């Protein structure tokens, strides 16, 4: 379980939470190309809706 660690210490009682967005600002977004996925499927053929619809 320790093999998956990603911080040094765990949350220790009254630790202050710093907010990092303090003014309105449009966001620039970076990522690694596989970090976002778009899972798509068709509407099932015999759905309750789309009953008599070709």
């Amino acid at each position: 379980q320790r093999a998956y660690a990603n911080v040094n210490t765990s949350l220790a009682d009254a630790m202050a939470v710093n907010i990092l967005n303090v003014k309105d600002a449009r966001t620039n977004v970076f990522w690694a190309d596989d970090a976002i996925r778009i899972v798509s499927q068709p509407i099932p053929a015999n759905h309750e809706l789309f009953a008599g619809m070709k």
Binding site: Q41, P42, I43, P44, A45, N46, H47, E48
Partner: protein, 541 residues
Amino acid sequence: ENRLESILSRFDADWTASDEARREAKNDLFFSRVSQWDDWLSQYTTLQYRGQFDVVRPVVRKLVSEMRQNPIDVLYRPKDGARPDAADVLMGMYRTDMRHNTAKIAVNIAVREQIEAGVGAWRLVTDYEDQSPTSNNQVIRREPIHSACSHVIWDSNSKLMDKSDARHCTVIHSMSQNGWEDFAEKYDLDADDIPSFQNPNDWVFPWLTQDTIQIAEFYEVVEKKETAFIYQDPVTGEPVSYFKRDIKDVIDDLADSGFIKIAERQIKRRRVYKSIITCTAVLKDKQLIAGEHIPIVPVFGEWGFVEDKEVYEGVVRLTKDGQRLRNMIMSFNADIVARTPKKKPFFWPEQIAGFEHMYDGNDDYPYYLLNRTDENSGDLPTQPLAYYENPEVPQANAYMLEAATSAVKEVATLGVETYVFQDNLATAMRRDGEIYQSIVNDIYDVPRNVTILMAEVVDLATGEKQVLNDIRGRYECYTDVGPSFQSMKQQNRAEILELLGKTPQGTPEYQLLLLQYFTLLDGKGVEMMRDYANKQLIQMG
């Protein structure tokens, strides 16, 4: 009035008319090529055994092999009253540019789709070659059409099997991003403006990526009277050349070369125009292509009209009900075998309390002991032991499995033999020969034979381009169907062997044998025999 509106009205009419047959053909292709368990993405679906126990596929394989063992090709033959060798040049050109792997593969694809779905098709196209051209620095090649049932939409008002009375036809192209880039490159289109058209496919399988880019090619045939120019050949006679084929290129180069116009008649012919269309605009308008016929050759299985509605069928459509029933019954029986309690004794816990280790399965004991007494009931009640009944396949399931398999075997018998399917393939090849002859007359350099040698009368324009000059006495041969060959030498060898097998042993037998040695291919020993045979024929006169 809009060209796009007229084209789309025609396409919508044909697409709506051919709806049922296309859906059944797509279902038959999916049934015989992907999976007999249809209905992907049915919302109400849990995990249950769905096994595929096949009986139609061996039949389809047998039929396809039978059709493959008996190839059929075009065979041009001289007409009635024509010169006895009126078809040699055309046959040579056809064998030359139809010997490649692509033509064979296209015919095979069409035949396999004819066997399974009910309709296949292929196309004929003309390309420019500088290394090995058939004639006039051009080639004519045959190309495959996959899923013709959904990718080729024919003109609705066509009552003929080969679709020779169809005035138009649209072929749908589906491409990925790189496919679209190559398509736009080859047709000089805008690759930045992604195109769109009717999607002819269906997300029926869990294929993780499907195609997205669609174009259409709309072919139309216009039959009209156009002006022809009658000249006088500087060698002898008077030829007829179309005005539109030399409208600007060599209209005065003919005069410079020494052609004097005699008269001018109006002759009625057909022209084929192609348009590249998306669902929103027309990309290419009326690009004129070579030939008089639409370059698409369709192949059918069982074909007909029911009530102003065309229906076709293969070998798979009728067997689907029996196959699906058999798959379902076998799945039910597999579930019976898997999830059913086995045959074990029924015990009261007090009957074996204390001897629980004698029935676990070991073989350490010579018998089994049971408790006999209870303190509050004096003695244990006596009743014969019960065992859980063994799993059994119901008589209904067994009868239905046998009867469904029998029904499939009884209905999956194409013909008695593939005689009718080979005849439909022969019809398609005859139409293919007609189209090829027209295209050859349009673009290739067809020599005219004189009885006074082949005389190719052509000339070059001021832009160094050469315009072929084909006379109107061009349809000197008709189309038949014969064995498939790769070259005229092979065809001549086959003819000589056929004559030899029937001629009795006389003087023509010697003649034919020496002729065979003459026509034989070349090595060293066969070279010696061929030299000897030539010498013998010459010295016998």
